[PDB]
Design a protein around this ligand. Sequence first.
Ligand code: 1IJ
Length: 290
Amino acid sequence: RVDFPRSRLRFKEKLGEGQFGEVHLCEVDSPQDLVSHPLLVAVKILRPDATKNARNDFLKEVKIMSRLKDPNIIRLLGVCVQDDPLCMITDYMENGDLNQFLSAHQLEDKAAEGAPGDPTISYPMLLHVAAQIASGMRYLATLNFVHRDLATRNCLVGENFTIKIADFGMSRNLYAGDYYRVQGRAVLPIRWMAWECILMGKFTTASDVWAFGVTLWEVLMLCRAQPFGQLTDEQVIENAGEFFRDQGRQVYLSRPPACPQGLYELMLRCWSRESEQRPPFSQLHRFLAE
Ligand SMILES: Nc1ncc(Oc2cccc(CCNC(=O)c3cccc(OC(F)(F)F)c3)c2)cn1
């Protein structure tokens, strides 16, 4: 297995920067360097002073991505692992992450004539978006692959509302509020987590389905609110306990203004107390893509 030629990566702009690296947008001329006119790629590079643990994390991140080959999953274009600055190369998704994208749009209304504010997105397009997410998750489930951090902040939008699922980890300061963190413990996206995940700390496909229910809720909110937004983290964790008790005191996310009751009731099924009663992704995908 040979390296992608880093000299073929022409820098365009720093796209982002993190604790152990930077992310660059680069152009690749004549991209017959890959088995799968300039190509736009995103590049993740480990900062030179990267500690030994960070480097190991990088190499493992790269191994994990090599598995993923699906239209609605992010794909690893190539890597630079043999020499000093370590790189991961992937497709540039020109419309950024799904959370920021939806935050910039308003809901379409064909019964009205109004002054042009933000760009619109129709209810059918929101479903097209959700369906693709379900298709990606469906593929991961056939790999018995567990995501563990599904949310709009981890989806990417390309041309023509094509969506891919990804995982940026949990260190980007923009979304630091979507994660609960206690010294000595693992970092947790509790507002997206199923109750048994919060209490017992183990993740499964059944729990991915829960998080998908929350991500769908985000999409239909046009990402205007954080889930359980008026609740503190302690309260959100307590609520998981209330699911465990099962005495009718657990609370759910409310129906979004856009959202038809039927679509909502689908979100409810994703939040069943019992794992095995939550719909499979295949069944989700079939509902949304109809
Ligand atoms: N605009 C734009 N376009 C593209 C772009 O790309 C990235 C740039 C920098 C870094 C990453 C993170 C890559 N690593 C993963 O995505 C990953 C890791 C582990 C598991 C994993 O599982 C999953 F695929 F199922 F999710 C995924 C993506 C960013 N911005």
